[PDB]
Amino acid sequence: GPGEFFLPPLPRLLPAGYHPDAARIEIASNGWVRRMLADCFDSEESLLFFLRQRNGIYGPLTVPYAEADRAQNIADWYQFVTVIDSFVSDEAALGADHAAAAETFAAVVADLREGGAGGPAASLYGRAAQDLWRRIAAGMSARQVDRLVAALEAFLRGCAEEIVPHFEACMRVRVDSFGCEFLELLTEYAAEVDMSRAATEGLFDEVHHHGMRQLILVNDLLSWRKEYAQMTTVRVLCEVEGLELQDAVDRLCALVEHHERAYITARDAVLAGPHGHREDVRAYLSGLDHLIGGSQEFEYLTPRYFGDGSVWDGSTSGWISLTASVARFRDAP
Amino acid sequence: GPGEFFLPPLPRLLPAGYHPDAARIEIASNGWVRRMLADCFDSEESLLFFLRQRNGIYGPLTVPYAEADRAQNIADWYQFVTVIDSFVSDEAALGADHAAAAETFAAVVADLREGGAGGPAASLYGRAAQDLWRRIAAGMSARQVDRLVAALEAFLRGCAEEIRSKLDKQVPHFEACMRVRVDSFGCEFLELLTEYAAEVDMSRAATEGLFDEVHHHGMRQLILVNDLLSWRKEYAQRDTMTTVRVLCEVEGLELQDAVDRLCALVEHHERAYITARDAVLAGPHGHREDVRAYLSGLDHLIGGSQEFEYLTPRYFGDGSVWDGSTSGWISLTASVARFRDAPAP
Ligand code: NA
Ligand code: NA
Ligand code: NA
């Protein structure tokens, strides 16, 4: 096996800012995870393992421009989806199997839209979902709440089902599963805009295609240690195309740059076009800029990817152990 | 011995603010610790144990009003002082007889005194101290630089007295404990660094004793809160210089009685700090922008130090993650601790 690969400097063209309250939001998010989601963990050990991933600072890194309340709401949302994704591992815990998922999660979310706790199916996470719905729905248009309903249903269905021929079919499945519709809706929420109409008309089809593909590729690169040990572009290149790891990494880093520059081109085309003068469109596009820059800053930071025990030292390029329990970028092999 | 104690709600009357770049300053401060101090630790794994304590967020929690560069300088200083404190506090690293202790300690003293010298340092502590001195002394008046020299000397005198208290197996009476800890806690450092962060020079006012009451009560508040939040980690260790040990072993109090007494004392000194501060603010210097900036700086030092001490795994155990709770039952025996609303049955 390789045991060690080199991650070169990535373009990092887009703003990566921290919310002015990022450190405090991470702690208050951690507090909310204990209060609302403790029962999803089989012990204090498992909860703290999760809290050590610092998932609570993702929100403030993606929406550094947002009002503190909305930044807290998004930080708690992302911890919530990560807990349910990673730690709610039983059809009993989630409230449905793959068979029952559709009509079950339709009724859970129907109940949440009404201000309830999503009923017996949602027993270990419905108080959590209710608290987030209360906070977030209040600052959303009714169209946005329709979209949140569909987004949360798909997410829980996606979870129930979880219990390639080529690279592009990998990209298609990574895009369908990354939660892009959530990210897009929450970007609108943070920026206090409603892009519901412009988005159905396809104004953002190109910026979303490149934006989300950049997010996914950066994520596949920085999550490769975690995934190697457990559906990802790195695995497709190595196994389906038979590339050496370093060649796969080099290919994916160049692909990050392709989609990053193409995102900027496509964003600039909307800014130059007949909706580009609109302030809400500008605010949304700045939102996506900070989501893309901030997600990558977050992905360097998290012990979810560098191993429980790791503490980021700010290094972003160099040699990294594929296998070691705890990793960091070293300036030599 | 008791297995737990109850920490009642403390007054928490003073502002605990985070620097707007706090998260980022912590990471960069972790980077400085690896670049300058990696070789102070026995391994990568002991370096990570130290980095997991989040000592890098102390700076941004105590000078949230400062410019980012000065906040970074203070963040790095506090991490460095925490390393020095853990080395001199460690009988194995230092020596557990006078002779061996004194030789090791003399090397630490000589290394840190290289900080403000003209020739390059050879030691790990010397190069770290030189780096921090060059960054900080650049933002200081000549009088503040002399005071920085005196602050290091005060800190080292205090460390020497804490070391001797272990060697001689002697718990000080409360007033001798507080008198040592004003040195060992680095109060002169914190005062000067608070002027530096606020970009003021209080050298003249301090010489005239404008802040004697403000300092007396504010520093006592800081030391007492630190003693309460550090007890979990200090309780099994021996002859350490903490008022919890003074009240238990010198004055014969049961742990919970000692804790309750020290919480009453935190509130005494915290209210006396606010009264003393308000007197300066109402007095013939109280309109001065620099005086007001300094006292606002001490408010944030006092509030932020307490916030930091609740969050750090240095106190709540490696692997702990603060949930924001500030009062309740705390285990002395658990490998990780947090405040609970019931005792262990
Ligand atoms: Na902050
Ligand atoms: Na996980
Ligand atoms: Na690192």
Numbering used by the authors:
A (entry chain B): 31 to 193, 201 to 267, 271 to 373
B (entry chain A): 31 to 375
From the paper:
Diterpene synthase VenA is responsible for assembling venezuelaene A with a unique 5-5-6-7 tetracyclic skeleton from geranylgeranyl pyrophosphate. A promiscuous DTS VenA containing an atypical 115DSFVSD120 motif was characterized to catalyze the unique cyclization of geranylgeranyl pyrophosphate (GGPP, C20), giving rise to 1. The monomer of VenA holds a typical isoprenoid synthase α-fold comprised of twelve core α-helices and four additional short α-helices.
To provide structural basis for the substrate promiscuity and unique cyclization mode of VenA, we first sought to crystallize VenA in its substrate-free form. Thus, the truncated form VenAΔ1-15 with the N-terminal fifteen amino acids removed was expressed and purified. Of note, the in vitro enzymatic assays indicated this modification did not affect the activity of VenA (we use “VenA” to stand for “VenAΔ1-15” unless otherwise specified). In the crystal structure, VenA is dimeric, which is consistent with the result of size exclusion chromatographic analysis, indicating that VenA forms a homodimer in solution as well. Helices B2, C, G1, G2, H, J, and α4 form the active site cavity, and helices A, B1, and C-terminal loop contribute to the dimer interface with a buried area of 2350.5 Å2. Similar to dimeric CotB2 and SVS-A2, the two monomers are organized in an antiparallel arrangement and each active site points away from the dimer interface. The obvious movements were found in C and H helices, which resulted from the binding of metal ions and PPi group by the catalytic motifs, including the atypical Asp-rich motif (115DSFVSD120) located on C-helix and NSE motif (256NDLLSWRKE264) on H-helix. The side chain of Tyr108 forms hydrogen bonds with the guanidine group of Arg344 in the apo form, but is rotated to the opposite direction in the holo form.
